A paper describes a structure:
The CD4-binding site (CD4bs) on the gp120 subunit is an attractive target for HIV-1 immunogen design. The VH1-2-derived bNAb IOMA directed to the CD4-binding site of the HIV-1 envelope glycoprotein is of interest because, unlike the better-known VH1-2-derived VRC01-class bNAbs, it does not require a rare short light chain complementarity-determining region 3 (CDRL3). Here, we describe three IOMA-class NAbs, ACS101-103 derived from the VH1-2*02 and VL2-23*02 germlines, that share many properties with IOMA, including an average-length eight-residue CDRL3 and show up to 37% neutralization breadth. These findings indicate that IOMA-class NAbs developed in multiple HIV-1 infected individuals and provide important genetic and structural information for the design of CD4bs-targeting immunogens aimed at inducing IOMA-class bNAbs.
ACS124 is a mAb that was isolated from the same HIV-1 infected individual, H18877, and was included to overcome orientation bias on the cryo-EM grid.
Residue numbers in the entry:
A (entry chain L): 2 to 9, 11 to 95, 95A, 95B, 96 to 106, 106A, 107 to 209
B (entry chain H): 2 to 82, 82A, 82B, 82C, 83 to 100, 100A, 100B, 100C, ...
Write the structure that this text describes.
């Protein structure tokens, strides 16, 4: 037995999200739905086709056709972004079956400009390493570019940048790291992290001084 | 009802993965208990169920390698998965099965779920982290807010968890995805954004746990200011 789910569903804030699950004679099987937010364990949000667990907002409702099940999220909030999984039990084989999951993305949230913080290495130098850390906080949409400079020269070697991660307040964060030797760190008068977001740039500069 | 997974985060290829779930709030004899896993970036995969009278069934793909069992005296149930390979790297969830006795078909679903345990199958050895403060510098405050953080370097396998002030500080906290380095070790950062006025009157401590290596670090982050 197999459960079909769309891979992606995009919905504007305040609108209604519909996640469909299709399977053979689904009409004769009870269907259950789980929400998995980033970095968290799943949570049951609908069981027995349409029953809502205690503590689950009434914005979540479950319905059933003969061949499909639908999880409907009304008045969607940014916090409802998650992967949603349908589940049934195949009584013939005594097997649990999950759908492949649907990623719900809430698009068109309001623009939010990043806050940039640059941390110089201090105690790390004594471990014979030097990592400059450039933290990029509280931005939307979740797309940034980072450029590093030593004095005025661009630096690409030793740079690693994470993919923007969603924060608990539904904005994005990202981090970028520049790896230097301790002697290299002391050999320049300044370093800069330049973050480009939505056509605007923020630049932070730090000088050796521990 | 609370479910608490436990067990090694690292298993060598061809060895046996063993995990245990400790159940509190209900008798282990009252419910069917299931294991689920999720390979990183992938969907949920059912492993099997157990009931204390011995009733069990399993994913047919896993049936020849897997056993689930109950320990009545400790209110625990366990997963045993033999001859593991990298295909078994996954987050493993213990769950309580709920059911409604409707005669025609089976009404069986999962609530609640444990937090999950990441098990990495690898011949590489465990490596504990080194933690460095990301201290607010003399120039790093941004208006009315200040960020500070902890850099957690060079550990294996995942995960590390970071809390702040023993969990009393949660607003503005963000722990980033770990970076897998060319060395094969992971590093990550954790930050918290706080009112700039609090740097002069509030202690900030990042609590770093790396269970695979049994390492705990409580690192004070002292503003330079």
């Amino acid at each position: 037995y197999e459960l079909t789910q769309p891979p992606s569903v995009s919905v504007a804030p305040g609108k209604t999200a519909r996640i469909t699950c299709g399977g053979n004679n689904l009409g004769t099987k009870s269907v259950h739905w789980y929400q998995q937010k980033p970095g968290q364990a799943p949570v049951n949000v609908i069981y027995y086709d349409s029953d809502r667990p205690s503590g689950i907002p009434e914005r979540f409702s479950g319905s059933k056709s003969g061949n499909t099940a639908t999880l409907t999220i009304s008045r969607v909030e940014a916090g409802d972004e998650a992967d949603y999984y349908c589940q049934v039990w195949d009584s013939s084989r005594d097997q649990c079956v999950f759908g492949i999951g649907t990623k719900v993305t809430v698009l068109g949230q309001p623009k939010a400009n990043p806050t940039v913080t640059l941390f110089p290495p201090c105690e790390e130098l004594q471990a014979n390493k030097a990592t400059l850390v450039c933290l990029i906080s509280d931005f939307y949409p979740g797309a940034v570019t980072v450029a590093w400079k030593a004095d005025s020269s661009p630096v690409k070697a030793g740079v690693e940048t994470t993919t923007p991660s969603k924060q608990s307040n539904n904005k994005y964060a990202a981090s970028s790291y520049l790896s230097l030797t301790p002697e290299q760190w002391k050999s320049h008068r300044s370093y800069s992290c330049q973050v480009t977001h939505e056509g605007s740039t923020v630049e932070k500069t730090v000088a050796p001084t521990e | 009802v609370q479910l608490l997974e436990s067990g090694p985060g690292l298993v060598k290829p061809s060895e046996t993965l063993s995990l245990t779930c400790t159940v509190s709030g209900v008798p282990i004899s009252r419910h069917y208990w299931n294991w689920i896993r999720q390979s990183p970036g992938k969907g949920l995969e059912w492993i099997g169920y157990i009931f204390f009278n011995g009733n069990a069934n399993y994913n047919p793909s896993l049936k020849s390698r897997v056993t689930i069992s109950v320990d009545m005296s400790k209110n625990q149930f366990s997963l045993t998965l033999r001859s593991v390979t990298a295909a078994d790297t996954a987050v493993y969830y213990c769950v309580r099965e709920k059911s409604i006795a409707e005669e025609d078909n089976m009404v069986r679903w999962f609530d609640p779920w444990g937090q999950g345990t990441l098990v990495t199958v690898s011949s590489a050895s465990t490596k504990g982290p080194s933690v460095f403060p990301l201290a607010p510098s003399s120039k790093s405050t941004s208006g009315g807010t200040a960020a500070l953080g902890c850099l957690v370097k060079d550990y294996f396998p995942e995960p590390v968890t970071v809390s702040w002030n023993s969990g009393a500080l949660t607003s503005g906290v963000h722990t980033f995805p770990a970076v897998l380095q060319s060395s094969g070790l992971y590093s990550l950062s954790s930050v918290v954004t706080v009112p700039s006025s609090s740097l002069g009157t509030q202690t900030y401590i990042c609590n770093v746990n790396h269970k695979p290596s049994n390492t705990k670090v409580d690192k004070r982050v002292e503003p330079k200011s």
